[PDB]
Design a protein around this motif. Structure first.
Motif, short mmCIF file in Angstrom:
data_model
loop_
_atom_site.label_atom_id
_atom_site.label_comp_id
_atom_site.label_asym_id
_atom_site.label_seq_id
_atom_site.Cartn_x
_atom_site.Cartn_y
_atom_site.Cartn_z
N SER A 1 19.06 23.39 -60.28
CA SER A 1 18.01 24.38 -60.67
C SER A 1 18.11 25.52 -59.77
CB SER A 1 16.78 23.63 -60.45
OG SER A 1 16.48 23.24 -59.13
N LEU A 2 19.12 25.74 -59.02
CA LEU A 2 19.42 27.04 -58.47
C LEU A 2 21.06 27.36 -58.54
CD1 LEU A 2 18.98 29.28 -56.41
CD2 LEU A 2 18.87 27.57 -54.80
N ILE A 4 23.21 30.89 -57.04
CA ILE A 4 23.57 32.37 -56.58
C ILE A 4 24.69 32.65 -57.47
CG2 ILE A 4 24.81 33.40 -54.79
CD1 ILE A 4 24.42 30.89 -52.73
N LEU A 60 23.31 42.10 -43.00
CA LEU A 60 24.09 41.26 -43.82
C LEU A 60 25.33 40.93 -43.00
CD1 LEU A 60 24.56 39.65 -46.46
CD2 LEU A 60 25.90 41.61 -47.24
N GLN A 61 25.65 39.70 -42.91
CA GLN A 61 27.06 39.21 -42.37
C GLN A 61 27.50 38.38 -43.50
OE1 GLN A 61 25.10 38.15 -38.38
NE2 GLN A 61 27.32 37.70 -38.41
N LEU A 62 28.87 38.36 -43.92
CA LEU A 62 29.45 37.50 -44.71
C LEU A 62 30.59 36.75 -44.23
CD1 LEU A 62 29.78 40.17 -47.95
CD2 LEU A 62 28.21 38.15 -47.92
N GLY A 63 30.79 35.75 -44.77
CA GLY A 63 32.17 34.63 -44.34
C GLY A 63 32.76 34.23 -45.48
N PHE A 64 34.19 34.22 -45.33
CA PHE A 64 35.11 34.02 -46.21
C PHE A 64 35.99 33.19 -45.69
CE2 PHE A 64 33.44 38.35 -47.34
CZ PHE A 64 33.14 37.95 -48.78
N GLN A 65 36.77 32.06 -46.73
CA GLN A 65 37.74 31.25 -46.32
C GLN A 65 39.04 31.97 -47.07
OE1 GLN A 65 37.93 27.01 -46.41
NE2 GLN A 65 36.04 26.88 -45.23
N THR B 5 32.02 31.38 -48.22
CA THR B 5 31.57 30.09 -47.73
C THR B 5 29.97 30.50 -46.87
OG1 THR B 5 32.68 30.77 -45.83
CG2 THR B 5 33.66 29.32 -47.43
N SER B 6 29.68 31.61 -46.53
CA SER B 6 28.50 31.86 -45.91
C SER B 6 27.96 33.31 -46.32
CB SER B 6 28.56 31.81 -44.48
OG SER B 6 29.33 32.75 -43.80
N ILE B 7 26.51 33.41 -46.69
CA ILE B 7 25.76 34.65 -46.46
C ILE B 7 24.92 34.36 -45.40
CG2 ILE B 7 24.34 36.08 -47.97
CD1 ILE B 7 26.88 35.09 -49.70
N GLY B 25 14.60 27.93 -53.83
CA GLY B 25 15.19 26.64 -53.95
C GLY B 25 16.10 26.02 -52.52
N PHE B 26 16.11 26.72 -51.74
CA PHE B 26 17.03 26.77 -50.65
C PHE B 26 16.32 25.65 -49.61
CE2 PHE B 26 19.08 30.57 -51.98
CZ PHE B 26 20.33 30.25 -51.93
N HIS B 41 24.15 25.44 -50.20
CA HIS B 41 24.06 25.15 -51.58
C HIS B 41 25.12 25.57 -52.59
CE1 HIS B 41 21.49 24.87 -55.44
NE2 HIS B 41 22.29 25.93 -55.72
N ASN B 42 25.97 24.67 -53.17
CA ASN B 42 27.10 24.57 -53.90
C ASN B 42 28.19 25.40 -53.01
OD1 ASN B 42 25.76 23.62 -56.11
ND2 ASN B 42 25.38 25.96 -57.04
N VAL B 44 28.06 27.16 -50.57
CA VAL B 44 27.82 28.37 -49.47
C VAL B 44 26.77 28.31 -48.76
CG1 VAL B 44 26.76 30.67 -49.85
CG2 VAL B 44 28.43 29.70 -51.66
#
Lengths: 110, 113
Positions: A1-2, A4, A60-65, B5-7, B25-26, B41-42, B44
């Motif tokens: 139901s959610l 991103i 904002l901070q972001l994380g990537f693999q 992987t992260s916000i 919804g979190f 969630h999914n 992330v």
């Protein structure tokens, strides 16, 4: 139901941010001046805005693999405005933290 | 070879942002030992960090977009969170859409399909 579905960043450093996130692995398509990449069902867009005249450090901070952490970091510091704050380090998972031209702390993991 | 992987959002309105993103919804878990809440969630991880009032409040560069169920009902609950306000009302588009502001001033786009 959610789900991103989109991350959007309004930037006054469009070219630097495009260069940055291409190296990370995003493939942007040009259509404000706007570039969109879609990856794993999430749309990552970059919008060109003007210099805000009071530059703030972003929330904002972001994380990537990613694959090839060390090689990626080498290429990222070749982008104007970008600098490495935490060098590639073995952790519990190799990890590096690098700053994008907008001043976001981007965490990278292999 | 690429995964998001992260916000992470550093906020001075932790309680309002927690309220806001729960409605979206979190499901946030607080840490056992900044004051930090993490939802995943999914694949992330969505984290909220408590920081102090920056004393020069800026309109943020980040916009987010979500696909949800019960768009109109969700928006009704979101405007009950302090600091939050609806800028584009639920509207039929080519896909019902709404834009709502979070306590930090991010423009959050919401869609129903």
């Amino acid at each position: 139901s959610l789900l991103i579905t989109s991350i959007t960043i309004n930037t006054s450093h469009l070219q630097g941010m495009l260069g940055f996130y291409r190296i990370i692995g995003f493939q942007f398509t040009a259509s404000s001046e706007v570039h969109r990449a879609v990856h794993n069902g999430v749309e990552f867009s970059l919008y060109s805005i003007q210099n805000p005249q009071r530059s703030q450090i972003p929330s904002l901070q972001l994380g990537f693999q990613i694959t090839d952490l060390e090689k990626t970091v080498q290429e990222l510091v070749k982008i104007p405005g970008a600098m490495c704050i935490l060098d590639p380090t073995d952790m519990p998972g190799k990890k590096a933290i690098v700053l994008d031209p907008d001043g976001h702390s981007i965490e990278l993991c292999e």
